Amino acid sequence: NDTLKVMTHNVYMLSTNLYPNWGQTERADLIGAADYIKNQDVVILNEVFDNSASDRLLGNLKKEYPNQTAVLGRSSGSEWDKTLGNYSSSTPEDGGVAIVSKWPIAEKIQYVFAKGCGPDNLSNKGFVYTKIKKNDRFVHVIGTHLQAEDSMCGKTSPASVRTNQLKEIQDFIKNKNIPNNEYVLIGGDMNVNKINAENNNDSEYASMFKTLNASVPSYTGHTATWDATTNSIAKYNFPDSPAEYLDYIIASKDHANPSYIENKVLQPKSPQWTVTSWFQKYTYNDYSDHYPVEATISM
Ligand SMILES: [Co+2]
Ligand SMILES: [Co+2]
Ligand SMILES: [Co+2]
């Protein structure tokens, strides 16, 4: 139909071995049945860390999105066409990134970043590359989740680490020799804040597009993707943190340049769910502490 619909959503599914009461299992069902995640061509998921809940979610999304990748950094067998980067089978946690699609996935590649804040690789953070055949056309979708802000980051800063991670993504894209007439999208929680930096050509926000050689999309919908002022989980965790705009889906300019590409932030609310933590009961109506970003790409 000459329109590509891609969504990315950091679903906040921390391991239940470390965070027992965040309703991971129930939200796997709520998200899986949610209306906001339907009718897409491809969906990028971030933070699908908990093994049981993530597999449950993927299972719930199987009907509409039967073509799925394994979760970044959880395994390294034939389920991946290639396992690149600093992959380690002994990390305490996986990368929490996965891509599902209603269309056949021709190639699945996982790549683990060389570095992050801290000298050790304890989560195989990185990206997932997919070559997808969407109605007689091959599109390329890379899903990722970049280094978060960390008080401790050695002699380097979170921004410098993210730039290096973005560099690995771009270097991989160039090396792949993808036809320049096919669409190449990079999406996920970049942990790069757009708020108050959209007009600053020197902001980390501006550098993101330069490093990935990507174009800037048209922005619609809500004004933030991690908002403690409207999101129930974010409010619980960080009541006074200003809203931030951290999730994106952008296109490589070294390939097919979309005549139009939009990133819309949605604010879907989930059915009410409750958890008990330290003898105190809490109720929420959000699927995650992050809001999903829905992209419309004209092809
Ligand atoms: Co998070
Ligand atoms: Co895991
Ligand atoms: Co976050």
Curated annotation (Swiss-Prot):
Regulation of its activity: Activated by cobalt and manganese ions.
Cofactor names: Mg(2+)
A cellular component term, taken from the record's GO annotations: extracellular region
Pfam families the UniProt entry points to: Exo_endo_phos
Molecular function, one GO term: sphingomyelin phosphodiesterase activity
Annotated S-S bridges: 117-153
EC number, UniProt record: 3.1.4.12
Subcellular location: Secreted
Reactions catalysed, as given in the entry: a sphingomyelin + H2O = phosphocholine + an N-acylsphing-4-enine + H(+)
SUPFAM superfamilies: DNase I-like (SSF56219)
GO BP, sorted A to Z: killing of cells of another organism
EC category name: hydrolase
InterPro entries linked to this entry: Endo/exonu/phosph_ase_sf, Endo/exonuclease/phosphatase, Sph/SMPD2-like, Sphingomyelinase/PLipase_C
Family: Belongs to the neutral sphingomyelinase family.
Chain's role: Required, with sphingomyelinase, to effect target cell lysis (hemolysis).
Name this polypeptide is given: Sphingomyelinase C
